[PDB]
Amino acid sequence: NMYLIIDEADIFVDMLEVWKQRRFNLRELTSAFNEHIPRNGVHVIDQLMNDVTSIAGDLHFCSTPAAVALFDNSFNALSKVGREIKNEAARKAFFDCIYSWEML
Amino acid sequence: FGGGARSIMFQRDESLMEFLETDQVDRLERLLEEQAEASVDISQIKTEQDALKKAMKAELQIK
Amino acid sequence: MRTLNFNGKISTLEPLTVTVKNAVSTSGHRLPRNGGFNAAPYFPGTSIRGTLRHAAHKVIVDRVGLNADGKSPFDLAEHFMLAQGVDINGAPGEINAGAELRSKNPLISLFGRWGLSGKVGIGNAIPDGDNQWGMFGGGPIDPYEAFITGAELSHRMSIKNATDEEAGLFISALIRFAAEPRFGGHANHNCGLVEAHWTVTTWKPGELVPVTLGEIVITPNGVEITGDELFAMVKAFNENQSFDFTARGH
Amino acid sequence: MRTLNFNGKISTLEPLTVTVKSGHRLPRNGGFNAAPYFPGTSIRGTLRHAAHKVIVDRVNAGAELRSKNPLISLFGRWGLSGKVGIGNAIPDGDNQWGM
Amino acid sequence: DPYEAFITGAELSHRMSIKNATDEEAGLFISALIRFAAEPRFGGHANHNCGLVEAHWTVTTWKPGELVPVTLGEIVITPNGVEITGDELFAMVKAFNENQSF
Structure with missing residues (x-):
């Protein structure tokens, strides 16, 4: 029916990057698996959550080499935690979630 | 392991009140009150320090 | 000059509990x-160590004597320094004065302070069997965890390089x-009164086997000190008149 | 100043039930x-009530209060420490318990 | 529903203590006992008649530093009455009763 006139299209395609964002909230994953919880691993999940707060600081997004390095290290230590979930179905769900995040 | 807390002996067991002199009792009361005041002051200043740490550079470290 | 090791058991006549901030959780006192x-x-060694340190301090002030007014000669600074090892009043010069300070103040040597290593080390008591712990304090009242009546708890202390007077002071503290052999908290509910015994064994370095100097048994019906060596230690501490507890440093 | 220990036995003349406040065990x-x-909480509560009845029939530096009020001296409130401690009553021999 | 309870005639070991007890407050404790x-009832189930029990209790003090305690006496509470022995305990009660310093 209608037309779309995007004024400031440079700002549009620049702001796509802010909207090209899917965030893996480690607190959300912590809360999600409260029954298949390898609680021994929780420290790691908190420790990484601390490091993010140290690196991310007050920013909603940061692409510094520190940020990508922490991304990789966090996901490797979460694959570490992956071999701690007891329920095999839950273990596979967690593994597939982290694998999807990795390919994304 | 370890843990626990050092505590004021004099508020745990009270037989020591019969050992201490009145001047020393006043000293103990002053100690307790002044440590409560120092505790609240240090709690406030450490909360401020923690908030500043959460805020985030060399100038910040100097501060 | 000897190294003393106390190895033995604590039969808890009542449940034994301790409220450690890290141990206690939202569930309650665990x-x-x-x-x-x-x-x-x-049962953490910190609780027993505090209890026996205060026993030592109380026997020290009692042996010092009480004036007609009923107060001890010591000041608040000395009390805190003896009991909690805190320099209330507030190094290379203390490098050699440490030995003399230990000589004149048996308690501060026995239980250390900031910078001065304590001769006595009081460890953690651990149950022998299993299922010797439960939940107590029913009432809305948060129940606390504790050991059970009659629970056999394996405890061990070690005084390193104890002179006759140091071990005498420790045995006097025991x-x-x-008198009131009580550990931990919950004095209300009488949780903490115990009945313990220890085998005192010394080990002259170089020897292949230690020698048992005797036994110290604490029961609600009395105290049995067997072995003349322990009595000699006690008599050495008691008869000594060369202690100056009005000392401090840093 | 004396520290007192009350050690001894309780004989039961009729079945003693407690924890009225899955099944009742x-x-x-x-x-x-x-x-x-037997829970010492109930025993200490009974002793508290008995001391309250007795006093009613008769009728850090803050320690004068325990010199003023023997009741709070013996048992104590949340703030002040209580002098008294009421252990539990443990069966001596086996059985002595039934459904 | 049915409950679980100690059978009649059961004997239970019990220990109490008064920390650094003074004459007056320990006299109050004895008076409370x-x-x-008069109504030796423990627990609940009062409608069920639970609580009726008797006891005998050696009271022993221990001056710190001595190797043994001294047996002040014993207190026996039975439906037949109250039985107390030892001059110390009677003196303590007689001290508590006329205490106008409360």
Whole structure:
């Protein structure tokens, strides 16, 4: 029916990057698996959550080499935690979630 | 392991009140009150320090 | 000059509990567990150490004597320094004065302070068997975890390089503590009164086997000190008149 | 100043039930298959009520209060420490407990 | 529903203590026990008649530093009455009763 006139299209395609964002909230994953919880691993999940707060600081997004390095290290230590979930179905769900995040 | 807390002996067991002199009792009361005041002051200043740490550079470290 | 090791057991006549901030959780007062959440509870050595340190301090002030007014000659600074090892009043010069300070103040040598290593080390008591711990304090009242009546708890201390007077002071502290042999908290509910015994064994370095100097048994019906060596230690501490507890440093 | 210990026995003339406040089972002395025990909380409450009845019939530096009020001296409030401590009553021999 | 309870005639070991007890407050404790002897009821189930029990209790003090305690006496609470022995305990009660310093 209608037309779309995007004024400031440079700002549009620049702001796509802010909207090209899917965030893996480690607190959300912590809360999600409260029954298949390898609680021994929780420290790691908190420790990484601390490091993010140290690196991310007050920013909603940061692409510094520190940020990508922490991304990789966090996901490797979460694959570490992956071999701690007891329920095999839950273990596979967690593994597939982290694998999807990795390919994304 | 370890843990626990050092505590004021004099508020745990009270037989020591019969050992201490009145001047020393006043000293103990002053100690307790002044440590409560120092505790609240240090709690406030450490909360401020923690908030500043959460805020985030060399100038910040100097501060 | 000897190294003394006390090895023995504590039969808790009443449940034994301790409220450690790290151990206690939102569930309630849980004993520290000696590992993960599913390890064996242990009674921390900190509680016994505080109790026996205060026993030592009380016997020290009692032997010092009480004036007609009923007060001890010591000041608040000396009391805090003896009991909690805190320099209330507030190094290379203390490098050699440490030995003399230990000589004139048996208690501060026995239980250390900031910078001065304590000769006595009081460890963690641990149950012998299993399922010797439960939940007590029913009432809305948060129940606390504790050991059970009759629970056999394996305890061990070690005084390193104890002179006759240091070990005499420690045995005197044990004697005094045997009056009200109570550990931990929840004095209300009488949780903490125990009945313990230790084998005192010394080990002259170089020897292949230690020699048992005797036995110290604490029961609600009395205290049995067997072995003349322990009595000699006690008599050495008691008869000594060369202690100056009005000392401090840093 | 004297520290007093009251050590002895309780003889039961009729079945003593407690924890009225899955099924109603007595407090267990550790685990689930050990002996049961009588809660000291109930005993201390009874002693508190008895002391209240007796006083009613008769009628850090803050320690003068315990010199002023023997009742709060013996048992004590949340702030002040209580002088008295009421252990539990443990069965001596086996059985002595039934459904 | 059915309950679990100690059978009649059961004997239970019990220990209490008063920390650094003074004459007056320990006299109050003895008076509380004496008054409890009139209605020696523990626990609940009062409608069920639970609580009726008797006890005998050696009271022993221990001056710190001595190797043994001294047996001040014993207190026996039974439905037949109250029985107390030892001059110390009677002196303590006689000290508590006329205490106008409360």
